[model samples]
Target: DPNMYENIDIADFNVRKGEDGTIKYVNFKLSGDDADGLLCEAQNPGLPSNVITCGESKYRFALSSGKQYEFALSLYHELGLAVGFYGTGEIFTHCRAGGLGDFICQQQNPTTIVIDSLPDAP
Candidate 1:
């Protein structure tokens, strides 16, 4: 059931750096089967303002299957990534399974997402 999606791809991932070498922005394109209406968010739970939401129930952005959907995260907030279907809810989250690399921000420190692949939701 974990592999319900095939060929999911994240392309053009770029993390912008500030003048002080801090993280300024993050951008990428997501594409694959059943990508339509996919919802995503980059969140810093401690600082709720760090949330970068792609789509929500009140404000829906219909992502089309096979077509790349672009996303951008701004501000200098360290966060984790969460992805899910519009109706089915969250299916993927960073650090949920443990030892998934350094994407998850630690304590009050800002960490960047340096990986290229999308792991199955834990």
Candidate 2:
């Protein structure tokens, strides 16, 4: 999966979905169905580490499967749906008392194009 595309001043073609919905905002909780090797955002705007106010934050990933990476790569090519890195319930992960400053914020599936950060805004 190594290409010379970086030669075009685009080394990190990897998208960066934000905390909003413009891209695939991984906003929500987890207590049910899931995927075996699907690539998608696990949260939205990121999440807080506290379970009491976690507001739907979950903890159990693909059990260490890399299929997710595969799904993300191919899907990004076929479609423009940017896979969300989502929240992890860190409150300060994106911006907390001082993690990143109080001025910022932060999926997947058979996705589509426009890779969130690929063209969100500045």
Candidate 3:
């Protein structure tokens, strides 16, 4: 519908590490029901590939769509890369991944959410 918008509520955010202990990519965790069978996309200026689309098979994961799921976002730059959620007009403000440590993300508005780069399992 023209008046309705779909959005994803992220429960956790983190950075995946390579075997060499270097940062590999970013992780976004969401409760299964929020995105169950929902096609989505993302946009960020600091990423090597500034966008992620729903059709990309490489980004798809085996995690249960009804239980929980996580997606990866590769980053080339690590500052001011407020991610844009394509399912809706949701924007995460001031996302930073400086070096090997995590940073804080502040919500710009009540509807917007925080995205921190904290390491987590499941």
Each candidate's TM vs. the true structure?
A: 0.30, 0.15, 0.29
What is the C-alpha lDDT profile of model 2 across 62-99, one tens digit per residue? 11112324112211111123432221111111322212
Each model's backbone clash number = 0, 24, 0
Model 3 misplaced stretches (Cα beyond 4 Å):
16-23, 31-34, 37-48, 54-122
Q: Cα RMSD (Å) between model 2 and the true structure?
A: 15.9
List runs of model 1 lying over 4 Å from the truth: 1-7, 36-51, 55-122
Write one digit per residue (lDDT tens) for candidate 1, span 1-122.
Answer: 33432333433433333334344333344443434323443322221124344444221222111112222222111124354322211112122111322232111222222222243245
Off by over 4 Å in 2: 1-24, 32-53, 56-67, 70-122
lDDT of 2: 0.23
* Local distance difference test scores for all models: 0.29, 0.23, 0.32
Give me the candidate number with maximum TM-score: 1
- Deviation of model 2 at 43, angstroms: 9.0
Give the TM-score (vs. native) of candidate 2.
Answer: 0.15
Error of 2 at 77 (Å): 36
